[PDB]
């Protein structure tokens, strides 16, 4: 445990990051299943061609009782990969595991053809895992357009970025682009100063709509750069032409190919050392013991087992919106767990969900109109837009106050949106 890792771990404990997380993770929903009718997606969308996800009104069959804030937290489902990454002295092998971490969060998107809640302006969501030593926090920093800012911290790695989802139904497919930059910091166990990786997430689309069998597809190219070394990785999510294929190549700073990896992003990813730096070889689509330098293949990631849950949620997703008894007294009034329309929907009370949604959305609009009448500039509570010193891009800088003020029971009047 390096000095900087211990210094980070000490901060996390002093700020009380795990207070209130004593309850065992939620294992299921009160709903055992549910019988929202299987309305045809085309029948709904044919009258809304060219619209955005947020401008559409959808039946509950195409809603999910999670927030966009919580879908972004599903980036962390396989965060163990990042501690593994920190343990490798070879920077290109750290990059391999960082890359596969970025791929690992797409298995959970399958079988959830549904719109998550559009977070209210100022809505927040926190999630800490004492068993993993990380804390995640996010604030909805914009409503027009919808933007979430995140900030995740752990002894060996940080992860933060902007969720800016730009969507469009073109009459055939529903397309989603992720416009924000993501920042992943590793504090290596050895042989390396703290290092910064950046990348943008792949696109997603709903296809099969006209065929009557909607399917979530993730597609496009991703490039991860290590700003310190500076290794880089190219990732290719193949677009549907039922192929879930993903492949990637990891290069050192001189363009030498060091690693390739590939698999199906709904199932598993394997990798191998590339022995000749100029090889054109890419992963063709049996050691489960860790990395290998001799060129044999090794497993890196496999999807978690996925029981049947209402709304087709994953086990990990079931933990996120849990109103855990020991957690509730710590939360700000803005936390997604307290959001009443989303809570009603999770419990299968769909008319209550529609009733509460109308109320909280009306109040949001009225507060915006009052601000505009008084020339009042909206200010985020927990983030401020700044210029990042390395990328020179605008980013949402966490102000460092949330967890300390939470520790000190100072949140009771930090927002009133539900
Ligand atoms: C009419 C309905 C069916 C339309 C709007 C719903 C489309 C779904 C499939 C879209 C809507 C929002 C999309 C969405 C938003 C945010 C992220 C966070 C990112 O880190 C992983 C992908 C992910 C999770 C994607 C996956 C695909 C989602 C969930």
* Largest sheet, strands/sense/barrel: 15 strands, antiparallel
The structure class reads: alpha+beta
Identify every distinct bound molecule in the structure, by name, code or SMILES: ergosterol
Shape: globular
Q: Level of helix content?
A: 10-25%
Number of strand elements: 19
What gyration radius follows from the Cα positions, in whole Å?
Answer: 22 Å
Beta-strand portion reads 25-35%
Number of domains: 1
Give the topology string: H per helix, E per strand: HHEHHHEEEEEEEEEEEEEEEEHHHEEH
* Tally of separate helices: 9
Distance between the termini: 43 Å
PDB class: lipid binding protein
Keywords: oxysterol binding, lipid binding protein
Assembly: monomeric
Entry title: Crystal structure of Osh1 ORD domain in complex with ergosterol
Short description:
The protein is α+β, with helices and mostly antiparallel strands. It has 9 helices and 19 strands. The PDB classes it as lipid binding protein.
What can you see in these coordinates?
This is KLLA0C04147p. Belongs to the OSBP family. Residues 348-371 are annotated as: Disordered. This protein is α+β, with helices and mostly antiparallel strands. The protein has one domain (1-418). The protein has helices at residues 3-14, 41-45, 68-73, 80-86, 91-104, 315-318, 340-346, 350-373, 402-407; strands spanning 63-67, 115-117, 124-129, 134-142, 147-153, 157-163, 165-169, 174-178, 182-186, 195-199, 203-207, 215-226, 232-237, 245-251, 257-264, 268-273, 297-302, 383-387, 394-398. The strands form three sheets. The chain has a 15-stranded antiparallel β-sheet that branches. Strands 1-2 form a two-stranded parallel ribbon. A hairpin with a 3-residue loop joins strand 15 and strand 16. The longest helix has 24 residues, at 350-373. It binds ergosterol.
